[model samples]
Target chain A: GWFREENDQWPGQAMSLRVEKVLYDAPTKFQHLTIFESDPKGPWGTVMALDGCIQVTDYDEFVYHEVLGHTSLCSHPKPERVLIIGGGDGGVLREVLRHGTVEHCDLVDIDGEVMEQSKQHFPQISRSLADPRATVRVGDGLAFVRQTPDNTYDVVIIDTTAFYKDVLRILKPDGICCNQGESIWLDLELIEKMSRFIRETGFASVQYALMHVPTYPCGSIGTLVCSKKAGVDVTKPLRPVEDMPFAKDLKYYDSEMHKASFALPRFARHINN
Target chain B: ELISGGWFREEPGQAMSLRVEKVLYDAPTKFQHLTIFESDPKGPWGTVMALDGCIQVTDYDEFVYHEVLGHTSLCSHPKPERVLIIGGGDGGVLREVLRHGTVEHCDLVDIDGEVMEQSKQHFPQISRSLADPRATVRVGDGLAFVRQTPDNTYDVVIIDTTGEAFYKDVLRILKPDGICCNQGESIWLDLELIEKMSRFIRETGFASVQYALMHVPTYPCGSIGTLVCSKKAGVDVTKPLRPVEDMPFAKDLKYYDSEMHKASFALPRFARHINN
Candidate 1:
């Protein structure tokens, strides 16, 4: 008579889950979610979602959402109203509330499953779904922009995988807009053409900057920042202690470092020309 | 002090000439060191005093000088023998004369004993051949030496003299069947000298007369002086007296090659202007 604890098989014991059936959706794409016994000695055993391209690990959602949310919202003066097109993870809303100036944050994601899955699995990034100012809308961002009133949004940060024609139609004039625009080497032509479109929209300034992400091709990626106002210089030097003190809390965006990130080599400089 | 000078001129379509002035040491090895100078109307006269040191008239490579003189006659003659070499103190033309080997006897008349001594000292290679038994090296005046020889005797006569007063005398003793070859100045500076030399060669009543060009880069304006006159009838200007390639001495040459021999005769366009 040894005392036994509940849900403890042994140290480092493997757990098993039963498979009901398998479904093939597309020739190249599939989705799966499964459940297994919850034991202290076993793996932290639950699979929320899986796809051909992306695996929804517990850490990935929190990391990607927190980065997309905080970078630009912290830079603007008073970003009260924010429109997020595809950040269903709700981390964008969580970081937007950290500003204190943001009274309301509107979210429109076409995939409601992504919101539900992110909210359930990645609580670190999606915890702000409980906030009162956060409104989750399941619809197209293009239709929402055309239907909404003009000059409404103070900030628009597009945290989508790709900025299609629909996302380009939605941004308000004079609003600070940031998007994941291009890879360092691959999408230079797309960035140039998009900059031209953004400039013609009477934006105050349009600028693109790149960051080093080791996994991407050429070990780097870029994001575009644009506004409706003219003569907005992005290359202005930043002092870490004085200009952007909030950068102290950031894991990546240092003010002095962010200013230097816009400097391009000779080959990349010709992209805009 | 009969100081003689030479000048070169280019005539249109005619050969270049080396005109001699003021004969110096016409006898005693017939040596003449001519000061070559140029006259210009608008510019200062250019002096070619350096030409004297440049021309190596006698040395181991004397075949180069002698071949053009000897073969220019021997190849034209039906049968050449009884040759006479005037003022060839270094024995270069005597070497060329012996190439025929048919000559019963060859006379090398030199005026200066010092020239032979100098040649033996400075140019032992060419001077050694002077010991050939067939050749008679007589130390005397070549002009008077030729007068003692029988008339119409020599089949070929070569005047290997420095351009001096005896140039006219060398032309006088040539038999009607004999041919004479001598050096002339460049035709770039003195047209009158060319005319005088040509008139002298013509007075000898040689049926065919011509001159060849030599490129001695070390010489002034990179040219050498030459003239070949024949006393025979109907000289063939088209054919070389000896195919320069076939000449046995060419194999031993350090400078003259068959190609260089032919190219030496090819005058530049400006040089052709002197003939006119």
Candidate 2:
């Protein structure tokens, strides 16, 4: 049997995954969650989706994690304090901790079940949630950001756009934030509008970056990297990836790829400007 | 009406199948089965064309595949005055080729005349270049045409189709400085097959072989690869010889910008291991 993702948000297309067995499926505190095991011998092993939208799969999770984790972190000069909003799976957190410059990080999510289940089923991704420098908080990311002190963190990574202004306030003047900007194929206007809004909300520069994640809608997704100070180019990395300890272990996202990720097709090249 | 259950399910593969809404055409041509459909009004793809149960082109994303195929190889050469495109019956590649004012003439060969005609009728935007005076459309075996073509005739030879046997024949007809590009399969779907094919291309004596990757949602993995090679040593197929802005048709392009040409050559770590 196959588990198909068909939603009104992305009309007329569907992504299907062959499900060998159902590991877990039930109503969670926030949304419906399902954890399934794909063919034992297949490329993708375990899969998890919240509300029928795929969050991560074992085979290609690194692409999304690495892109989100390193793009903004590498763009900032000294990313010591990082804040992650709604990354309950801890995939992004795992990538965030790889930077030796990161002294401490806080991940806030509304759903505790997502974190707990991921810790159980996807330990490889969620293990970093327990890292000594990492703190896991089960609460509303919007409220968390609103209450955070001004100039609180150097980098903030988010999954939603509801709190862009709040995110802008919490970051230091020269801080950077990366948001999970939607797909280029399906959400170009949405991304364009978000970039406009992010800049209008007092950010200095907004750049849209892309990555190829096979399981994602349209097989790709974008990230909006915004800097609070003027004259900062968020497209290029501040340091070489070789300087990071986990450079060799990365399946994707290198210095070349980090720069390449911002090179958009003609249709999207002027999206940020 | 051609679809069952108000949806068109792409034939299932070992991994999975993709289904779309509102199919508009389905029939058999002289050479292969063809299907054309309109995606749901809410979907990203406006209309899609498929052949032999495989997705070929979509109204919304055709430029991504066509531009990469049509522009990359031609751009690699210093001046692509004469170009040969094998199996691009739809004329999408032909349209992109004509965009390069440098292309004095182009020969488009496909086995089926019906696919070309159907594309003109069903996908006029893609097949519009078939009627261009600079293009000579032939309905014949692409493999046979390459075997008989004289040596060193073309500045650039692009194979919209793929076959292991075409590499040597392609190298024979290409001018000393010519470049060749063929449809390389998905990097994520089959790394082993890509590795094998890359080895075959290298063994055929091409100076350089680089697997270019791009996003094509209609394809098997929402992405595809193009195997590009240069006939002369020290020629970089990774960067275009001229900037896209210099082309008169640059503004008309939806994809295939100057940056995208180089960016497409950057492979994932695992893929890099295989290609290197």
Candidate with best TM-score: 2
Clashing pairs in 2: none
- Stretches of model 1 off by over 4 angstroms after superposition: A1-273, B1-63, B163-172, B189-191, B244-250, B255-264, B270-276
Per-residue lDDT, model 1, residue A85, is: 81
Task: Give the per-residue lDDT digits (tens) of candidate 1, residues A142-187.
Answer: 6777677666777787776423333334445445677766653445
TM-score of chain A of each: 0.69, 0.96
> Once superposed on the true structure, which residue ranges of model 2 sit more than 4 Å away at CA?
A160-162, B11-24, B162-165, B274-276
Candidate 2's TM-score reads 0.95
TM-score between candidate 1 and the true structure: 0.38
What do the candidate models score in CA lDDT, each in turn? Answer: 0.52, 0.85
Q: What tens digits encode model 1's per-residue C-alpha lDDT throughout B16-52?
A: 2233342322222245432222222121112222112
